[PDB]
Design a protein around this ligand. Structure first.
Ligand SMILES: C[C@@](O)(C(F)F)[C@H](NC(=O)c1ccc(C#CC#CC2CC2)cc1)C(=O)NO
Ligand SMILES: [Zn+2]
Length: 299
């Protein structure tokens, strides 16, 4: 039996918002069975809770944002990617400000803090969304597609005409029957281009960004003096983002995702189209883990 998982102990962390530049205190807490991931703005009275679900996604221009009325929770995809890769079904995410801390720009710090606290399996079947039919959305030259697949794999292809990508292709495929999310995906940092940052800051965006929490690229080079963690770190973060955006479905996926220059906006459009086309998916459990198409590491 593949059981639901929550946190064994609370996780506490402080950081800065990538776009707001605000200092934020973060607390992850255990949650009962079938709670899902629920964000909670504890700086407000009364506290405002936003379930990390596709129906609550607001603006998506920079990062994935959850909204409830006039209240927002910004930049959720990196923490949600850590949630998905670790198999965490239920948790409360308390924040003292509107944006999740960026940490080092990747999901690595979140993954380490969670695994240091430990996970707790719960006495209930883990629910999966199994893709039954192909579902694709396009807009312009961008495309995102779900494909039936007995497992979970993610492929992505970006097409930048930038010298930092000169040499090789900008494509990567990850199949978690062999790829380690922790070792090969979680540490890929977000990236920004120096030409955009001065404009972004003019619009009160990317205010917390620096070489401490992002790969900074000029017209030719990565400016971080210590370089990259992966040779293909850029596309690996696109895969990291997709895994986090996909977890807004509320359950782990049994299927294949393929992204072609897709972003947070098209990712959410794919989820909304999938959810609406109930012929294309179903909820499944596995009463015997030994016959499941996926497996999780020990809690
Ligand atoms: C990677 C992706 O482009 C992805 F969408 F492709 C997207 N990155 C961003 O938005 C983004 C990342 C970093 C900065 C920055 C800074 C700085 C600085 C100091 C030196 C002046 C700005 C924007 C993402 O990860 N969204 O979730
Ligand atoms: Zn990102």
């Amino acid at each position: 039996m593949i059981k639901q998982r929550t946190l064994k102990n609370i996780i506490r962390a402080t950081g800065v918002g990538l776009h707001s530049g605000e200092k934020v205190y973060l607390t992850l807490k255990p949650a009962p069975v079938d709670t899902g991931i629920v964000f909670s703005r504890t700086d407000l009275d009364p506290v405002v809770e936003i379930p990390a679900r596709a129906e609550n996604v607001g603006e998506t221009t920079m990062s994935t944002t959850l909204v409830k009325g006039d209240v927002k929770v910004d930049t959720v995809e990196h923490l949600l990617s850590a949630m998905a890769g670790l198999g965490i079904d239920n948790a409360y995410v308390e924040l003292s400000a509107s944006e999740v801390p960026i940490m080092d720009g990747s999901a690595g710090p979140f993954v380490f803090l969670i695994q240091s606290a430990g996970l707790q399996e719960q006495e209930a079947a883990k629910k999966f969304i199994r893709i039954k039919r192909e579902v694709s959305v396009e807009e312009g030259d961008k495309r995102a597609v779900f494909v039936p697949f007995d497992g979970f794999k993610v492929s992505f292809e970006i097409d930048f005409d930038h010298p930092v990508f000169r040499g090789r292709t900008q494509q990567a495929s990850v199949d978690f029957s062999s790829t380690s999310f922790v070792k090969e995906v979680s540490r890929a940092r977000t990236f920004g281009f120096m030409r955009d940052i001065e404009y972004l800051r003019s619009q009160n965006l990317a205010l917390g960004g620096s070489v401490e929490n992002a790969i900074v690229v000029d017209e030719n080079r990565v400016l971080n003096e210590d370089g990259l963690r992966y040779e293909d770190e850029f596309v690996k973060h696109k895969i990291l983002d997709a895994i986090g955006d996909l977890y807004l479905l509320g359950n782990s996926l049994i299927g294949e995702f393929r992204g072609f220059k897709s972003g947070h906006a098209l990712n959410n459009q794919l989820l909304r189209t999938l959810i609406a086309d109930k012929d294309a998916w179903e909820v499944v459990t596995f009463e015997d883990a030994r016959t499941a198409p996926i497996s999780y590491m020990r809690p």
